[PDB]
Ligand binder design. Structure first.
Ligand SMILES: *[C@@H]1O[C@H](CO)[C@@H](O[C@@H]2O[C@H](CO)[C@@H](O)[C@H](O)[C@H]2NC(C)=O)[C@H](O)[C@H]1NC(C)=O
Ligand SMILES: *[C@@H]1O[C@H](CO[C@@H]2O[C@@H](C)[C@@H](O)[C@@H](O)[C@@H]2O)[C@@H](O)[C@H](O)[C@H]1NC(C)=O
Ligand SMILES: CC(C)CCCS(=O)(=O)C[C@H]1NC[C@@H](O)[C@H](O)[C@H]1O
Length: 492
C-alpha cells in the first residue's frame, strides 16, 4: 500500500523512514493462479521487497544457470522467525508516540508487515537492560516467596507482547531464556563473572533454581501469556569465563546434563507447564557436537530435551557443527535462538552488508536442518543501546526518540524475505543447481503445497536465472548484483 521513504546515512544502502503517520507496508497477500509466480525484490540500490508477477512457461530457451525444484526430497519443518523483546527493545519502542509504536509493531508482526511469530523473552535482566535485577533478589528465599516481576515485565515487556499478539495473523510462540540466577544461589555471589550454581545437582540450590523457571511461567500465565519453550541457560559457557561482564550463569556440559536430569526436567514435568519445550545449549554452535553428546547420551536428561538452541556468533563451518549434530541426533531439532551484528561503528544505518549477513546465515542454517531463526534486540537506539555494560550492537529497527522516528535497516528486509513467506509448518525441499554459482538459494514448500524460493546474490554481477518446477514449468528471471529475491507460486 505504502512504499519505503529512503534516507542515506553514508553507508552502502538506505534505510526506510517511518514515524507516527507513515510507515511502509504490504497489502494483504493474494493467490495468483497456476502458471503465475510472485516475486519480491530488495536491492542495494533501494528496492524494498517490491512485488511483481510473471509467467511460469512450458519450456525454456537459454544458456544460463538453472535451479530445479525437487519436492520429493523433504527435510525439516519450520517453527518460525522473530526477535527478542529485551528491556532495551521495549524501552525504545515505548519511547515513541502510540501511533508510531503500532506502525513498528505492525512492521514486525502484522501481515501488513513481515509476519514474525517468535518472541524471545529474557528472564529478568541481561546486558540489554538499564539495571541489574532478578525476580528474587532478597536472599535466603529458597521457596521463592518474594518472587515478583518488576516494572520491566509488568509495564514494558508484557504489554508490548500483548499488542504484538493482537496484530499478528499467525500464532506467535514465546521463548524464554535466563541470563543469571539470584546471586545468593551462585558460587561467586555476583550477577556476572565466573560462577555456577552453588552445590551439586539435586540439592536445595538446584531445586530452588529449577522452580524459579516455574515461578516465571506462573507469573506470565497470570498475565495470560503462555510459552512455547524455554532454554536451560543463555550461553552457559559464558559463566565459565573469568571476569565475564554481562549477567551469566556457568554450566559445563556435564553440569547442564545433570541439572536437566535431576532438577529442571522433573520440576517442569511435575508442573502445570509440562507441555513447555526445553531447549539446550542456547550458545555458539562452536560447542557442537560435543555439547550434544554430553547431554543427549544420558536418557534421564535426553527424555526432557526437545531441541538444541544455537547462537550465530563464533561462526566465521556449519557441516561440522549443525550437520554432524543432526547426524548424531536426527530427532532433536536445531533452532537459531539469537543473532545480531570490530573496527566498525556499532550501528551502521543503511548497511546492505549486514543485511546480507542475516540472509546468508539464515540460508546456511536452513540448509543444515535448523527449524527456525531468532533475532536479538527488536529495536535499539542510534548508539546501539541502551546497554548497561557497553555491548552496543546493531538492530533491524533503530529508534530516534528525539524525532518520533524509527529506521528500518536492510537487516529488517533480509529477514522479512524469510519470515513473511515461510509460515510455521513449511518444509524445506530439494533445490538442485545445474552448475556452480555465486548464489545462495533455499527452497521450501508451504503447508498448503505452494512453493517458496529465496535467492540471494552476494556478488556484484547480474546472474540470469531459471527456476524449474517439474509440475508447473520454467520461471525466467534475473538475480541482480547485491539483491535478494523471494519467489512464490502455486503448484496446482
Ligand atoms: C512522517 O513521514 C512522512 C513521510 O515522509 C512525512 O510526510 C511527508 O512530508 C513532506 C513535508 O516535508 C511532504 O513533502 C511529503 O509529501 C510527505 N509524505 C507523504 C504525505 O507521504 C511527515 O512529514 C513525517 N512527519 C514529520 C513530523 O515530519
Ligand atoms: C520445448 O522445446 C523442445 C524442442 O523444440 C524443438 O527444438 C527447438 C530448437 C525449436 O526448433 C522448436 O521449434 C522445436 O520444436 C520441444 O520438443 C518440446 O516439446 C518443448 N516443450 C514443451 C513442454 O512444449
Ligand atoms: C562481550 C562478550 C564477551 C562478547 C562475546 C560473547 S556474545 O555471546 O557474542 C554477546 C552476544 N550474545 C549474548 C548477548 O547477551 C549479547 O548481547 C550479544 O552481543
Amino acid at each position: 500500500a505504502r512504499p519505503c521513504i529512503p534516507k542515506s546515512f553514508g553507508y552502502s544502502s538506505v534505510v526506510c523512514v517511518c514515524n507516527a503517520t507513515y510507515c511502509d507496508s504490504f497489502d494483504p497477500p493474494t493467490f495468483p493462479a497456476l502458471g503465475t509466480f510472485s516475486r519480491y525484490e530488495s536491492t542495494r540500490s533501494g528496492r524494498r521487497m517490491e512485488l511483481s508477477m510473471g509467467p511460469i512457461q512450458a519450456n525454456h530457451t537459454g544458456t544460463g544457470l538453472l535451479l530445479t525444484l525437487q519436492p520429493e526430497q523433504k527435510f525439516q519443518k519450520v517453527k518460525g522467525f522473530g526477535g527478542a523483546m529485551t528491556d532495551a527493545a521495549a524501552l525504545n519502542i515505548l519511547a515513541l508516540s502510540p501511533p508510531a509504536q503500532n506502525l513498528l509493531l505492525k512492521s514486525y508482526f502484522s501481515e501488513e508487515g513481515i509476519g514474525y511469530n517468535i518472541i524471545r523473552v529474557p528472564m529478568a535482566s541481561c546486558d540489554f537492560s538499564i539495571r541489574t535485577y532478578t525476580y528474587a533478589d532478597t536472599p535466603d528465599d529458597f521457596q521463592l516467596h518474594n518472587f515478583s516481576l518488576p516494572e520491566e515485565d509488568t509495564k514494558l515487556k508484557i504489554p508490548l507482547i500483548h499488542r504484538a499478539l493482537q496484530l499478528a495473523q499467525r500464532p506467535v510462540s514465546l521463548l524464554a531464556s535466563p541470563w543469571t540466577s539470584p546471586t545468593w544461589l551462585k558460587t561467586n555471589g555476583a550477577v556476572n563473572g565466573k560462577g555456577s550454581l552453588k552445590g551439586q545437582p539435586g540439592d536445595i540450590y538446584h531445586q530452588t533454581w529449577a522452580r524459579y523457571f516455574v515461578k516465571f511461567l506462573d507469573a506470565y500465565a497470570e498475565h495470560k501469556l503462555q510459552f512455547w519453550a524455554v532454554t536451560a541457560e543463555n550461553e552457559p559457557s559464558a559463566g565459565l569465563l573469568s571476569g565475564y561482564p554481562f549477567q551469566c550463569l556457568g554450566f559445563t556440559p556435564e553440569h547442564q546434563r545433570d541439572f536437566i536430569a535431576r532438577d529442571l526436567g522433573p520440576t517442569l514435568a511435575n508442573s502445570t507447564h509440562h507441555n513447555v519445550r526445553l531447549l539446550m545449549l542456547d550458545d555458539q554452535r562452536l560447542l557442537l557436537p560435543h555439547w550434544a553428546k554430553v547431554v543427549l547420551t544420558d536418557p534421564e536428561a535426553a527424555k526432557y530435551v526437545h531441541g538444541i538452541a544455537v547462537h550465530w556468533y563464533l561462526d566465521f563451518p556449519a557441516k561440522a557443527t549443525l550437520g554432524e549434530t543432526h547426524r548424531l541426533f536426527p530427532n532433536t531439532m536445531l533452532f537459531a535462538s539469537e543473532a545480531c551484528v570490530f573496527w566498525e561503528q556499532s550501528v551502521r544505518l543503511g548497511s546492505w552488508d549486514r543485511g546480507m549477513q542475516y540472509s546468508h546465515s539464515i540460508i546456511t542454517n536452513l540448509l543444515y536442518h535448523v527449524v527456525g531463526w531468532t533475532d536479538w534486540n527488536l529495536a535499539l537506539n542510534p548508539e546501539g543501546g541502551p546497554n548497561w555494560v557497553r555491548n552496543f550492537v546493531d538492530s533491524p529497527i533503530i529508534v530516534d526518540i528525539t524525532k518520533d522516528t524509527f529506521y528500518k535497516q536492510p537487516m529488517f528486509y533480509h529477514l522479512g524475505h524469510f519470515s513473511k513467506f515461510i509460515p510455521e509448518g513449511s518444509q524445506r525441499v530439494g533445490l538442485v543447481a545445474s552448475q556452480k554459482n555465486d548464489l545462495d538459494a533455499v527452497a521450501l514448500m508451504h503447508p498448503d503445497g505452494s512453493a517458496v524460493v529465496v535467492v540471494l546474490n552476494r556478488s556484484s554481477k547480474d546472474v540470469p536465472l531459471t527456476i524449474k518446477d517439474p509440475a508447473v514449468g520454467f520461471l525466467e528471471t534475473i538475480s541482480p548484483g547485491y539483491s535478494i529475491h523471494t519467489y512464490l507460486w502455486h503448484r496446482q
